[PDB]
Design an enzyme around this catalytic site. Sequence first.
Site, mmCIF file in Angstrom:
data_model
loop_
_atom_site.group_PDB
_atom_site.id
_atom_site.type_symbol
_atom_site.label_atom_id
_atom_site.label_comp_id
_atom_site.label_asym_id
_atom_site.label_seq_id
_atom_site.Cartn_x
_atom_site.Cartn_y
_atom_site.Cartn_z
ATOM 1 N N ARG A 135 -45.176 7.498 -95.270
ATOM 2 C CA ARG A 135 -44.587 6.547 -96.203
ATOM 3 C C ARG A 135 -45.118 6.657 -97.658
ATOM 4 O O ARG A 135 -44.428 7.113 -98.533
ATOM 5 C CB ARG A 135 -44.802 5.148 -95.635
ATOM 6 C CG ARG A 135 -44.135 4.016 -96.376
ATOM 7 C CD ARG A 135 -44.049 2.765 -95.534
ATOM 8 N NE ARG A 135 -45.338 2.173 -95.346
ATOM 9 C CZ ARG A 135 -45.540 1.030 -94.742
ATOM 10 N NH1 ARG A 135 -44.541 0.362 -94.264
ATOM 11 N NH2 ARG A 135 -46.752 0.569 -94.622
ATOM 12 N N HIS A 165 -52.360 3.642 -92.928
ATOM 13 C CA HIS A 165 -51.644 2.741 -92.074
ATOM 14 C C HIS A 165 -51.049 3.497 -90.880
ATOM 15 O O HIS A 165 -50.717 4.626 -90.987
ATOM 16 C CB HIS A 165 -50.590 2.005 -92.889
ATOM 17 C CG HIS A 165 -49.994 0.829 -92.205
ATOM 18 N ND1 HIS A 165 -50.737 -0.221 -91.749
ATOM 19 C CD2 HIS A 165 -48.717 0.538 -91.902
ATOM 20 C CE1 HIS A 165 -49.949 -1.112 -91.198
ATOM 21 N NE2 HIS A 165 -48.719 -0.674 -91.276
ATOM 22 N N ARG A 221 -56.932 -5.452 -91.491
ATOM 23 C CA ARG A 221 -55.814 -6.119 -92.090
ATOM 24 C C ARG A 221 -54.984 -6.861 -91.080
ATOM 25 O O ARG A 221 -54.313 -6.263 -90.332
ATOM 26 C CB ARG A 221 -54.943 -5.058 -92.718
ATOM 27 C CG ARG A 221 -55.553 -4.360 -93.891
ATOM 28 C CD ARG A 221 -54.635 -3.363 -94.535
ATOM 29 N NE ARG A 221 -55.060 -1.991 -94.390
ATOM 30 C CZ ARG A 221 -54.510 -1.131 -93.566
ATOM 31 N NH1 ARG A 221 -53.532 -1.471 -92.814
ATOM 32 N NH2 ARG A 221 -54.946 0.062 -93.492
ATOM 33 N N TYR A 266 -14.471 -20.277 -88.330
ATOM 34 C CA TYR A 266 -13.657 -19.214 -88.869
ATOM 35 C C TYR A 266 -13.186 -18.268 -87.797
ATOM 36 O O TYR A 266 -13.905 -17.880 -86.920
ATOM 37 C CB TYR A 266 -14.405 -18.428 -89.935
ATOM 38 C CG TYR A 266 -14.625 -19.089 -91.270
ATOM 39 C CD1 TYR A 266 -13.579 -19.501 -92.046
ATOM 40 C CD2 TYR A 266 -15.882 -19.254 -91.767
ATOM 41 C CE1 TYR A 266 -13.787 -20.087 -93.251
ATOM 42 C CE2 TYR A 266 -16.085 -19.830 -92.975
ATOM 43 C CZ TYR A 266 -15.031 -20.240 -93.709
ATOM 44 O OH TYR A 266 -15.260 -20.801 -94.904
ATOM 45 N N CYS A 312 -21.220 -20.120 -90.005
ATOM 46 C CA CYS A 312 -20.871 -20.193 -91.391
ATOM 47 C C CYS A 312 -22.047 -20.055 -92.323
ATOM 48 O O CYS A 312 -23.138 -19.892 -91.922
ATOM 49 C CB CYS A 312 -20.077 -21.432 -91.686
ATOM 50 S SG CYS A 312 -18.669 -21.728 -90.678
ATOM 51 N N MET A 313 -21.775 -20.079 -93.599
ATOM 52 C CA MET A 313 -22.781 -19.888 -94.607
ATOM 53 C C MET A 313 -23.806 -20.972 -94.532
ATOM 54 O O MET A 313 -24.941 -20.743 -94.719
ATOM 55 C CB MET A 313 -22.149 -19.836 -95.988
ATOM 56 C CG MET A 313 -22.860 -19.003 -97.039
ATOM 57 S SD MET A 313 -22.245 -19.058 -98.696
ATOM 58 C CE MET A 313 -21.255 -17.640 -98.724
ATOM 59 N N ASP A 314 -23.350 -22.173 -94.313
ATOM 60 C CA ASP A 314 -24.166 -23.314 -94.414
ATOM 61 C C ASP A 314 -24.168 -24.187 -93.191
ATOM 62 O O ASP A 314 -24.877 -25.081 -93.144
ATOM 63 C CB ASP A 314 -23.771 -24.131 -95.629
ATOM 64 C CG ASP A 314 -23.326 -23.318 -96.788
ATOM 65 O OD1 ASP A 314 -24.109 -22.677 -97.399
ATOM 66 O OD2 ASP A 314 -22.170 -23.356 -97.137
#
Lengths: 383, 383
Positions: A135, A165, A221, A266, A312-314
């Site tokens: 990486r 790592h 870590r 939907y 849905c979104m919300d």
Amino acid sequence: KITVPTWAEINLDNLRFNLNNIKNLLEEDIKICGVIKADAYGHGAVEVAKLLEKEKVDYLAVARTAEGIELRQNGITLPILNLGYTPDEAFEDSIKNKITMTVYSLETAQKINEIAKSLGEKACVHVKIDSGMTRIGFQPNEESVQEIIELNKLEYIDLEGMFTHFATADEVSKEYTYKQANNYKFMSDKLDEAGVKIAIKHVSNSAAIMDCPDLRLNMVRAGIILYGHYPSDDVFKDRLELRPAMKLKSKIGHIKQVEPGVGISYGLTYTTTGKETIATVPIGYADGFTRIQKNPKVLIKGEVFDVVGRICMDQIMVRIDKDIDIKVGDEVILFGEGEVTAERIAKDLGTINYEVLCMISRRVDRVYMENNELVQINSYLLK
Amino acid sequence: KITVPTWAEINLDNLRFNLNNIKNLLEEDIKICGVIKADAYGHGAVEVAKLLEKEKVDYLAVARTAEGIELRQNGITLPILNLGYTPDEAFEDSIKNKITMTVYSLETAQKINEIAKSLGEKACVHVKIDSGMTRIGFQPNEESVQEIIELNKLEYIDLEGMFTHFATADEVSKEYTYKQANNYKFMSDKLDEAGVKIAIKHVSNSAAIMDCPDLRLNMVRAGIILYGHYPSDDVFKDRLELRPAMKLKSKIGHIKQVEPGVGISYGLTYTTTGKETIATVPIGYADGFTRIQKNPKVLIKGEVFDVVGRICMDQIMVRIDKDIDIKVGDEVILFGEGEVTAERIAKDLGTINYEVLCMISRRVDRVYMENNELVQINSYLLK
């Protein structure tokens, strides 16, 4: 107190618990870095850091300059390492803010050195080694040994640390991991040979901490384990005992009875069979409760329920088939308790728990609990 | 200027372009409500409202009280609707901040009123009719009419509006949609019959706006089109020209050549076949570049490239096969340009463009372009 419909509840005791358990696995002289990158894996970086300061951790780790700067803006004094890339444009702010930088090229160290010199500050860095994640980092070779020696020479660079790592530690086979370690050992032996003092050397993540005691070095870590979740199921869980710190929660916003053969949400991808009780909940995809799910579930009043229709979104809609005393405003649990876990959602998704924790969106207030008390509310939207 | 590795770039000229066209579809009387829930579907709500105020839209819509309050706190004076649920805990703040609340029960309306009474302030509401999405709203029946009549009679309630929402308007068949419309028509007729005045009647979303020209009432609500995307692929696209406003951009942070047969990133899911050039880019899933993606792509210097390996929290690896002159630091586009679209990512994911737009994390700064000038930078993390 809580004026949002949907929020994330973080139990401080749990974090404390987890960390202490983490400590019991370590000798007095192993430094701990708490990795609080990505807003503390969704838990709130600033609050976690405060806690980590209280508990005397050695190092904090971030992914971005701003993330570290955030902590400094909020009066964190612990040492901060940015585990990743720092653009040239951020070098100066990093130095001023005492953000330790990660470097994998001499070229970078030179630009950094130029900037520090200009500011009359020594800039502190940690050298990444690529031991096979492939990486970031120096490749484990002689050139890189030389490049590092040249690096350590620069004035206005304090070469505090070197680290690598691991790709595969959470897995059952540790062959790659130890192979990764030798490559690091090679860099260590050589620089030591050439007389380069590196004060903090570290290679271990959560899995390595649990599974791999011969890999401590100067520092370890901890990330995911801090939040009470395992890296994988193939780690040695009995070694460390964990409570999750987070619950994603909401409130019933509507409840009603729906006739047979009525479609919901939907696309009308669900229809009621018989008369069904339907509750609408004000969490949706834009809160990080992803539409991708497929078998989304909720916990209300101790019972698991299916989310019906398209998310849905919300908002979401939930079918109440068990019978229980519910009403608008009662609490709903999306994950963090009982059968509803970040892990469960993740499996359904085909991702990892780390992603699900991270998914919680900006508009979800983070609410902190201690000794079963609401102690803090953070809005990311409001002053 | 831009000190972050990864940012989202928003072109204001594009939003303006999109609105104009939308405006061009409407009569010199039809109100527009700019729908900016979810941080303006990720594009940054405050900045987007500011623009919207500038081009004189009638109303603004949001999903949560705090979303409205955030705007108010930023000087936005336009009327705001919370389309969703309001908790009791948030009523006082809505009244105070001039947030219009959606109501779908008489009982919740009484509670609002009682609160409005003590503040001396008339609270402004819109009533939601459930016409077939089965989410929130009154059931369209006579008993509902009666209540609404009763509701309208409350003293510190100004019942300004009535509305419903469509499930299948983005679809080719509009049979459900017209079915939904009729139910609403029913409600509207009954109420006129009762003489309840109702200033703004609205039902249309972007899809209805495009395809359903007969469904303007007093107001239409535009969301997805405002950001230059289509609700579905089955709308009448050629009736409205759109430019997408958002770009997800990152920068190359590491390049190297990788020996053949060497694994990259977590679990070593990808192995290198021969000598490959691999770029590391500082975006990951915690930015919203979800790990869930099967076929992640990125576009650099005009060309598309495969993402290789499991996506990390903050990092990805990119395989550069075509030959182009690239340098650590050069820009990377995740979506918003050419072949890399939100729609593509969505299709791969199994979701819709709306969720992808939403997925952008807190830590991705929002960068605003006008006239080919950067004009505003926003950190959600700092200051």
